[PDB]
Structure formats: structure tokens, C-alpha cells
Paper text:
In this study, we have identified a non-canonical ABC protein encoded by the [name] gene in [name], as a [name] (MABP-1), which confers inducible resistance to the macrolide family of antibiotics. MABP-1 adopts an unusual three-dimensional fold with a kinase-like domain and a linked accessory domain. The accessory domain is indispensable for its function where it participates in dimerization of MABP-1 and in erythromycin binding.
According to a DALI search the kinase domain strongly resembles that of an ancient UbIB protein kinase (ADCK3). The accessory domain consists of six α-helices: α1–α4 helices (residues 1–120) and α6–α7 helices (residues 161–206). These regions are insertions that are not found in the canonical kinase structures. Crucially, the α1 and α2 helices in each subunit insert into the accessory domain of its adjoining subunit, resulting in an N-terminal domain-swapped dimer. The accessible surface area that is buried upon dimerization is extensive, at 2021 Å2 per subunit.
Numbering used by the authors: 43 to 442
Write the structure that this text describes.
Amino acid sequence: SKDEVTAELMEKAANQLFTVLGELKGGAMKVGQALSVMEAAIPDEFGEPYREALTKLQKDAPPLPASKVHRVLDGQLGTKWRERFSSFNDTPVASASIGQVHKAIWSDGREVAVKIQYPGADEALRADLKTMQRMVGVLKQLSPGADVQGVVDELVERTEMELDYRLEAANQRAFAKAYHDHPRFQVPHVVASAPKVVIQEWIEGVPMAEIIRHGTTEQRDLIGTLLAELTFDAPRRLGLMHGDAHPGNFMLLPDGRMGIIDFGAVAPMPGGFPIELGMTIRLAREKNYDLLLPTMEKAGLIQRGRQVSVREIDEMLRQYVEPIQVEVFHYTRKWLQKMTVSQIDRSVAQIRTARQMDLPAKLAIPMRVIASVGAILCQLDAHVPIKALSEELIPGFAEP
């Protein structure tokens, strides 16, 4: 096809762009130059231990043979692991990030998904982490003006999240407890958890990706509205956001509930959804700039002590304001595209953005999640009563 190609070309362009972003905002030199420095400044002897580790992963390429699945299970649940099951299907039904998923029946008769990590994944990912740590050290010491603050911590955190299934299992447990018997959301219970094996209740539904491709209008509207609701309900209900969203995370169940099956990106929100956001959107809708600008500055949504353009503020907030100006908003790719085109031509005026590029965490986290969700709503072509959801669930949005 000519579309596979275009998709991969877009992926390529995005990675190129992010590499350039890293060069300009982080590494303080081009990646090739940095690489030359790194190769000079990192011992040759570290090369082979790196390579070997990657190799143990390349071996036994997906899917894993039955024997090795069984070996991982031996390692995590003990050599008598079969006693935990009524039956186990050796043929995987799906692939995961660094493992594969099997369908099985638990000893209590419940159907379960069993995620098995690939045996070579731990060593490979930790070797990769070590290499990137060394490289960060090289940049910090030898690349003038490099900003690598928080980078090693982020790498360690991501690596640990990929390698230890128990973390996501705990997130999922919090959610499964919160949404037990909920009329609209279904979270499968964690049946067992180990670093390299995690087992949860099996649920059958229509994948959101399928609805995005071929869904009926009603399927699209329903699962989109459910996702929108989850987004604001979760921090209100249990002080967590489900986090960075991807259609693989969700499904539409026969009874009209949305199944949520992945919890790797759960984000902390102890105080709930910050009131400043809903407040800002309400004031912006009303074009009450006299109150809007101080509210935003106090919140840290715009830079302090600056001359700002209300036109730029409007542009900044329109993607949040336009959907709640009608009872039911039609989230479309066309609209999102319109939201990407700037109102202020820079040849007309050379202003410095009022936008906050150092958002406070409590704002940055939900805003990022919301961006991913909104993009998904547009892919769904979903009609969503976001106005009513916002009034009901988002602090500060309803007229006081």
C-alpha cells in the first residue's frame, strides 16, 4: 500500500523533529557530533556487554515457544504454577510491549488474560538504560550548555515501569476497586501479579481502534462520551487520572460499558482536577478578560509580568472553549486541524508567547492527558455532551 508508507514516513518525520528538539533544548549539540564525543569518551570495553544483552532478547523472537512461556511462569509463580490454573492456552492471543498475552482459565473458573514478559527483556532494557545513563553523563560533562536535568530519573522510571508488572498492577487495583459495579466503566480485577507475569480478568468487547475505523455513529458517540467522562471522573473519584490515553486501552462492551484494560500511564492527582482550569475555561468563554488574565497568571497558565495579547489568549484556549459552547460537540479531525492553525501571523507582529512553557505539574499532567483524549475523540468522530460533563465533573466550570 501507499498508506503504510505514508504512516511510516510520518512516524519518521515526528522522530526527526523530536531529535531536533532534543538537540536544541537538551543536548546542546547535533546528535551526530554528540555521538562522536560519546564514542570517544565511552570505553570500547562497554560495547560487547551491551551487545550481548540485546542479543538475548533477539533470540526466540515473538511469539515465544510454549516451553519458554512455561519457563517464565516457573520463574514467577513457581514450577507448580499449573495448579493455579484450571487450564492454560499455550498459543498467545496478543502481543504486549515486551511480552505476550495468553488466554487461560483460573483455578476458580474465571477466564483470565496472562501477560508474560519476554525472558531477555530485563537484561536488554537495563543494559540500554545503563548506556543512556553513560551518554547523559557525557553530555553533562562535555556538551557546553547541555540541559539534562531530570533525564536519568525519567529513564530509570520508564524502564522500571516497563520491567516490573507489579507497578501497573497496583494502579489497576486502585481503579478496579473504584469502579467495581459502575454502570458505565468496567475495570478487570488483578488476579495475580509478579515482576514478569501479570494476570487479570478476561473481558470481551469491541476495541476502540475498531470503532475508530468502522464504528457506527452510536458506537463512536458512546465510547467517546465514556472516555470523556472517565477523564474527569477518575481524579474526582479516586485522585488519579487514567493518564496518557491510547485506543488500545479501551473497548466497548455489549452492555454499553467501556472496558479499560491498561493502566501503565496512571497519573497522580490527589487534590483532584485543579479548579483553575475549569474556571479559566468559563471566564474565557464569557470573554471576561479583566478576570481571566489575573486568574491565568495566578494559576501559572501564562507567564508572569508580561504584556500579553488577548488574541493569543483566545487562540490558546479555543480548543477547550469551542466544545463547551454547544450542548453536544462534534469532535472531528477537521475541527482539530482548524485548531492547529495560528491566528497571529508572525510577519504581522513579533510577540513572545504568553504561553507557559514551564507549567506547574498539577496543571501539566491533566492538560497532557486531555490533549491525548481530545485527539482520540476527533479520531472517533464522536458527538459528546462535553458541556454537561464539564458542568457536573470539572471544578470551577459551572456557573456559580
